[PDB]
Scaffold this active site. Sequence first.
Site, short mmCIF file in Angstrom:
data_model
loop_
_atom_site.label_atom_id
_atom_site.label_comp_id
_atom_site.label_asym_id
_atom_site.label_seq_id
_atom_site.Cartn_x
_atom_site.Cartn_y
_atom_site.Cartn_z
N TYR A 26 99.33 6.75 83.65
CA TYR A 26 99.99 7.58 84.64
C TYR A 26 100.79 8.67 83.96
O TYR A 26 101.21 8.52 82.81
CB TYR A 26 100.90 6.74 85.54
CG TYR A 26 102.25 6.48 84.96
CD1 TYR A 26 102.43 5.53 83.97
CD2 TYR A 26 103.36 7.16 85.41
CE1 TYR A 26 103.67 5.28 83.44
CE2 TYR A 26 104.61 6.92 84.89
CZ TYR A 26 104.76 5.97 83.90
OH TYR A 26 106.00 5.73 83.38
N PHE A 36 108.33 14.39 83.37
CA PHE A 36 109.43 13.63 82.80
C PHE A 36 109.00 12.35 82.10
O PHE A 36 109.86 11.68 81.52
CB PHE A 36 110.46 13.27 83.87
CG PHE A 36 109.96 12.30 84.90
CD1 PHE A 36 109.05 12.69 85.87
CD2 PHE A 36 110.39 10.99 84.90
CE1 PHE A 36 108.60 11.80 86.81
CE2 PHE A 36 109.94 10.09 85.84
CZ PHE A 36 109.04 10.50 86.80
N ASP A 37 107.73 11.98 82.16
CA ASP A 37 107.24 10.78 81.50
C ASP A 37 105.73 10.83 81.43
O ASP A 37 105.09 11.65 82.10
CB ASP A 37 107.70 9.51 82.23
CG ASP A 37 107.49 8.26 81.41
OD1 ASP A 37 106.63 8.26 80.51
OD2 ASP A 37 108.20 7.26 81.67
N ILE A 56 108.53 -0.17 91.96
CA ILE A 56 109.00 0.39 93.22
C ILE A 56 107.94 0.19 94.29
O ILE A 56 106.74 0.17 94.00
CB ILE A 56 109.35 1.88 93.03
CG1 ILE A 56 108.15 2.65 92.50
CG2 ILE A 56 110.52 2.01 92.09
CD1 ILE A 56 108.36 4.14 92.47
N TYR A 82 113.07 5.71 94.36
CA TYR A 82 114.34 5.22 93.85
C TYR A 82 115.50 5.35 94.83
O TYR A 82 116.55 4.76 94.60
CB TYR A 82 114.67 5.93 92.54
CG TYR A 82 113.83 5.47 91.37
CD1 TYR A 82 112.47 5.28 91.50
CD2 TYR A 82 114.41 5.21 90.14
CE1 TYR A 82 111.70 4.85 90.45
CE2 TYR A 82 113.65 4.78 89.08
CZ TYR A 82 112.29 4.61 89.24
OH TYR A 82 111.52 4.18 88.19
N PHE A 99 102.85 11.21 91.16
CA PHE A 99 102.23 10.58 90.01
C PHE A 99 100.80 11.08 89.85
O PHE A 99 100.33 11.94 90.59
CB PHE A 99 102.28 9.05 90.15
CG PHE A 99 103.64 8.47 89.90
CD1 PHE A 99 104.33 7.85 90.91
CD2 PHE A 99 104.22 8.56 88.65
CE1 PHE A 99 105.58 7.32 90.68
CE2 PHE A 99 105.47 8.04 88.42
CZ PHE A 99 106.15 7.42 89.43
C1 LIG Z 1 113.27 -2.04 78.82
C2 LIG Z 1 113.87 -2.50 80.08
C3 LIG Z 1 113.41 -1.93 81.40
C4 LIG Z 1 111.90 -2.08 81.53
C5 LIG Z 1 111.27 -0.78 81.18
C6 LIG Z 1 109.87 -0.69 80.73
C7 LIG Z 1 108.96 -1.87 80.86
C8 LIG Z 1 109.36 0.59 80.13
C9 LIG Z 1 108.70 1.43 81.21
C10 LIG Z 1 107.67 2.36 80.59
C11 LIG Z 1 109.76 2.18 82.00
C12 LIG Z 1 109.98 3.59 81.48
O1 LIG Z 1 110.88 3.56 80.40
C13 LIG Z 1 110.64 4.63 79.52
C14 LIG Z 1 110.52 4.52 82.56
O2 LIG Z 1 109.55 4.66 83.57
C15 LIG Z 1 109.83 5.68 84.50
O3 LIG Z 1 109.78 6.96 83.83
C16 LIG Z 1 108.74 5.65 85.58
O4 LIG Z 1 107.63 6.51 85.46
C17 LIG Z 1 108.82 4.79 86.67
O5 LIG Z 1 109.55 5.13 87.82
N1 LIG Z 1 108.17 3.63 86.67
C18 LIG Z 1 107.43 3.18 85.49
C19 LIG Z 1 105.99 2.91 85.88
C20 LIG Z 1 105.91 2.00 87.10
C21 LIG Z 1 106.70 2.58 88.26
C22 LIG Z 1 108.15 2.80 87.87
C23 LIG Z 1 108.79 1.46 87.63
O6 LIG Z 1 108.26 0.32 88.26
O7 LIG Z 1 109.79 1.33 86.88
C24 LIG Z 1 110.36 0.04 86.97
C25 LIG Z 1 111.82 0.16 87.29
C26 LIG Z 1 112.68 1.13 86.53
C27 LIG Z 1 112.43 -0.65 88.35
C28 LIG Z 1 113.66 -0.18 89.07
C29 LIG Z 1 114.84 -1.04 88.65
C30 LIG Z 1 116.10 -0.57 89.35
C31 LIG Z 1 115.95 -0.73 90.85
O8 LIG Z 1 117.10 -0.24 91.50
C32 LIG Z 1 114.73 0.03 91.36
O9 LIG Z 1 114.54 -0.30 92.72
C33 LIG Z 1 114.29 0.83 93.52
C34 LIG Z 1 113.47 -0.32 90.57
C35 LIG Z 1 110.11 -0.67 85.65
C36 LIG Z 1 108.72 -1.29 85.62
C37 LIG Z 1 111.13 -1.74 85.32
O10 LIG Z 1 110.48 -2.98 85.20
C38 LIG Z 1 111.83 -1.37 84.02
C39 LIG Z 1 111.57 -2.40 82.95
O11 LIG Z 1 111.01 -3.65 83.28
C40 LIG Z 1 111.21 5.53 85.14
C41 LIG Z 1 111.61 6.84 85.82
C42 LIG Z 1 112.28 5.12 84.14
C43 LIG Z 1 111.76 4.00 83.26
O12 LIG Z 1 112.76 3.61 82.36
C44 LIG Z 1 113.72 2.81 83.02
#
Ligand SMILES: C=CC[C@@H]1/C=C(\C)C[C@H](C)C[C@H](OC)[C@H]2O[C@@](O)(C(=O)C(=O)N3CCCC[C@H]3C(=O)O[C@H](/C(C)=C/[C@@H]3CC[C@@H](O)[C@H](OC)C3)[C@H](C)[C@@H](O)CC1=O)[C@H](C)C[C@@H]2OC
EC number: 5.2.1.8
Lengths: 107, 352, 414
Positions: A26, A36-37, A56, A82, A99
Site C-alpha cells: 500500500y 506520507f508512507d 482501522i 483516525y 490508499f
Molecule cells: C510499533 C508499534 C505500533 C505498530 C506499528 C506497525 C506494525 C508498523 C506499521 C507499518 C505502522 C506504520 O508505522 C510506520 C504507520 O502506518 C501508517 O502510516 C498507516 O499507513 C496506517 O494508518 N496504517 C498502517 C497500515 C494498516 C492501516 C493503518 C493501521 O492499521 O495502523 C494501525 C494503527 C496505527 C492502529 C491505530 C491505533 C490507535 C487507535 O486510536 C486507532 O483507532 C482508530 C488505530 C497499526 C496496524 C497498528 O497496529 C500499529 C502497530 O501495531 C500510520 C499513519 C502510522 C503508523 O505508525 C503508527
Amino acid sequence: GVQVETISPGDGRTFPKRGQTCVVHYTGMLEDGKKFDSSRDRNKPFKFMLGKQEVIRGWEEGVAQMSVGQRAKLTISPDYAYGATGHPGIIPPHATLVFDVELLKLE
Amino acid sequence: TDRVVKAVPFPPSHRLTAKEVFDGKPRVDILKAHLMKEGRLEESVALRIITEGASILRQEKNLLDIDAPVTVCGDIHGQFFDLMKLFEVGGSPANTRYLFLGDYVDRGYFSIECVLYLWALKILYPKTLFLLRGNHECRHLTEYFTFKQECKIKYSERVYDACMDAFDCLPLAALMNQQFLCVHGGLSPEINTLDDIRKLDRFKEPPAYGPMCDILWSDPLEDFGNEKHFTHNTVRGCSYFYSYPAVCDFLQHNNLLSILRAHEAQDAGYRMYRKSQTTGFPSLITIFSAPNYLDVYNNKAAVLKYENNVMNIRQFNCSPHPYWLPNFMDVFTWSLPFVGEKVTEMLVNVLN
Amino acid sequence: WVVGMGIVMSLIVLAIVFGNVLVITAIAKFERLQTVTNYFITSLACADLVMGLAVVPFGAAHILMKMWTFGNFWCEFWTSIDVLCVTASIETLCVIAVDRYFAITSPFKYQSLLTKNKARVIILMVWIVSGLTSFLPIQMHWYCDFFTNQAYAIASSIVSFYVPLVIMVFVYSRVFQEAKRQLDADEIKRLGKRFKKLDLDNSGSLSVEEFMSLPELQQNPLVQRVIDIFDTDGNGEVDFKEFIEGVSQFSVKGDKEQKLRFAFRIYDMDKDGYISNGELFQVLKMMVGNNLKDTQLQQIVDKTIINADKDGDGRISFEEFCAVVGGLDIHKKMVVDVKFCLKEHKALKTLGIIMGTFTLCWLPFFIVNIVHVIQDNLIRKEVYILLNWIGYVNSGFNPLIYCRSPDFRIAFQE
Ligand SMILES: C=CC[C@@H]1/C=C(\C)C[C@H](C)C[C@H](OC)[C@H]2O[C@@](O)(C(=O)C(=O)N3CCCC[C@H]3C(=O)O[C@H](/C(C)=C/[C@@H]3CC[C@@H](O)[C@H](OC)C3)[C@H](C)[C@@H](O)CC1=O)[C@H](C)C[C@@H]2OC
C-alpha cells in the site's frame, strides 16, 4: 464512509476468509496527493488479521470486497478513519485518506 | 544491554566546533568522513559556513558566463549517498568545472547535509563551480513539504532562517560558452531578448506571475509533431507551455543553439528531441540525475559532459542509505498510542 | 565491667550516627522520595543526630568518672540540649499522624490544598518553640547530676511528654477506625467475588497460565509485561494483596504522575530505573512483529537514544522521558470505570509502628520520675540511670524499621 473505485481488476474467484491473514502493498496519501508512507519505502509487505480490531475499521470493511491480484483506490471518510482525535505527528484532525492497496497473496 | 545486533555502525555524538573544520580554506575530507556517518556539526559552525557562502554568492551577476570545458548535472533532491556517487563518477572539483541546475533540498531526508557540503565546497572553490536556483527554494513550498521539520529537529530554527536568507540571492540564467543557454525550466513568451533578463531583480520571494515565476515553472510541450506560444499548463497550474515555433523564433532572433532543462524525470535519465534543420543540433535536452526518485520509479540517472565539440552522455547507478521514520518521529511517540489501547482493552476484558 | 561497658556505649554512638545518617543519604540522593511525608521523616532523623552526638556521649562520660570536667561553663547546658530532644521528637511525631489523617479521610483536600514550600515552614515552627520552653529554666535555674524540688519536674511532665502522648494516640485511632471502612465498602467485595470465580487452582494464586485461559486475551501481544508489573511481590504469581492496588492504579480521580509512571514501567524491564538499548529493542520488537526489518529497527532506536541523552551516560531516565513524551495526552487514554483510590493506605503500617516504639520506651522514665517525685522512695535510686537510658536506644531504631519499604530498600541495597 468507505468506497471502492477499481483501477485495474483481475481474477475474482478467490475471496478472503473470516480469520485468515492477507498480505498487501500500500502507498498512503492524503486528499491533495502528498504522500506520507509506503510499503515500498521498506522492502517488506504488510500483514494483518482480518476480523480483529488492530486495523482501522475502513480497511476491515473495504478490503474484504477485493480478491487476489487487484489494485484499487479506497477513500476513508473521517468516521472509519483516525477520527477527530487523529494521530500525533502525521495526520491532522478530520483528514480524509486515499490508499492504493493492492492485495498480493492469500495465506 | 550493550547492543543486541552489532553489525551496524554507531553514529558519532560529538559535534565539531571549529576544531579542524577551519584552517582560509575550510576542510573537506573530514566533512566527507564525518557526514557519511550521520554526525552533526555545532550550530555556530553551520551558521558560519552558510553565511560565508551567502556572502560569496551575493556579488554574483544575474547571468553567468563560463568557458568551454564543463560538466552539466541535474537536480539532486537531497540524496547525499547518490551525490557522492555523482562526484566519484565525474571528476574531482579540483580537476573539472561543474554547473548544477536543479533544486537541492526538498523531498529527501538529507537536505541539510547536502546543502552544507555543497556550500562549503563552493566557499573553498570560488571560481570552478557554479549553482543555479530552482523552483524548490521558496518559502511556501519548503514550508509545505518536509524541510522545516528537518531544520527544527536536527538543528535550531535560526539555521533555517539563515538558510532562507542564503537561498535568497542565487543567480538564475547560466549562459555557457556564448553558444548555449541553461535555465532551470523553460523560457516564457513575455521574455524575448537575452538583454531583457539582465535587468530584473532576484532578491526576493518569487511572485505568482511574470518572467520570474515563468522561468522557474515553465514546461515544454508533450505532444511534439502536431499543429500550431502561451498555452496554459495543467499539471503545475502556475505557468505556461511553449511550442516548437517559439523555440525556433528565439533561436533565430538571437544567435544560440539550444536550451537545457532539469524537471521531467525519465526512465532513461535523458531524452533529446528533433534536430533543428538550421544547424543539425538538437534543440532541447532534459537531464535527470537522481536515481530511484521517491523510491518508486526505479530509474537510472545521467550526467552530461561537454568537451572538444563532442556532446557525449554518461549513465549512472544506484546506492543505499540508512532509514528514518516518516516526518522524523521517535519510538516513544511512535508506539505510545498502541500501548494505551492494548492495556485498556486487556483490563476491561479481565475485570468483567 | 569497665572496658566492655565502654564498648557498648562506643558501639551505641556509632550505630545511632550510622542509621540516623543512611536515611538522610537516601532521601537527599534520589528524587523519587521527595514526597510530602519524607521531609518530616528527615526532621525526625536529624533530631536523632543531635542526640546522636552532643547529648548521648557526654552523659556517657558521667557513668563512672564521678565528675565532668566540661564544668559549669556548659555542664548545665547539656541539660538544655537533652530536653530539646524528647520535646521535638514528640511534636514531629504528632504532626505525622494528624496529617496522614487529613489526607486519608478526604484525599482531595490534602491532595491539592498544601504544597511542599509550606511544610518546611511548619517543621521549623515545631522545633524552635519547643526549644523555647526547654531553655526557659535551663538558665533561669528555677530548680553533673540533675535535681529540682517539685516545680520543674511537674512542668516538664505536664508539657512535652504527657500532652503529646495524648493527641498523637487519638487522631491515629481515628485514621485506624476510618481507614478499615474503605478497604471493605460494597465495592472491594465485587473484585473479591471475581477473584473467587476466576481462580481454577482454588488456592488464591493466579498464575500467568491461569490468565492465559481467558478466551479473548490469548492473542494480546503484551500480557506478560503488565502481569509482571502487577507482580510486585516478585515470585511469579498474582495474589489478592496486590491485585487491588494494581487495578486501583487506574481510576478517574487519579493524577498525571502515577499513570505516566506506569506507562514508563512498561518499557523498563528489571525495575532498575534505566532504559538501555537492549530493553528498548526487545520491548518494541515484540510489538512490531515482522513488518519492519531488524537493522532498520536498530538504526531508529539508535537515533532516538542519541536524541534523548542529555546527561551523557548513554541511557534515559524518568525526567528525560517526561521531556520527550510530555505533550501527547496519554493520561486520558487509560481509564477504567473503577472508583476507589487506595493510594493513601500504601504506607500506614510503617509510619505507624514508629508512633508506637517512641511511646513504649520513653514512657517509663517520665512515669518513673513523677513517681520518684512523690514522698515514697525505694532502694531503686539508681534506677533513673537504669531506665532513662532505655531511651537513648529508641532514637537508634527510628531508621531501622524503614528498610521494609521498597523505595528506601532500593537505596539501602544501593
Ligand atoms: C510499533 C508499534 C505500533 C505498530 C506499528 C506497525 C506494525 C508498523 C506499521 C507499518 C505502522 C506504520 O508505522 C510506520 C504507520 O502506518 C501508517 O502510516 C498507516 O499507513 C496506517 O494508518 N496504517 C498502517 C497500515 C494498516 C492501516 C493503518 C493501521 O492499521 O495502523 C494501525 C494503527 C496505527 C492502529 C491505530 C491505533 C490507535 C487507535 O486510536 C486507532 O483507532 C482508530 C488505530 C497499526 C496496524 C497498528 O497496529 C500499529 C502497530 O501495531 C500510520 C499513519 C502510522 C503508523 O505508525 C503508527
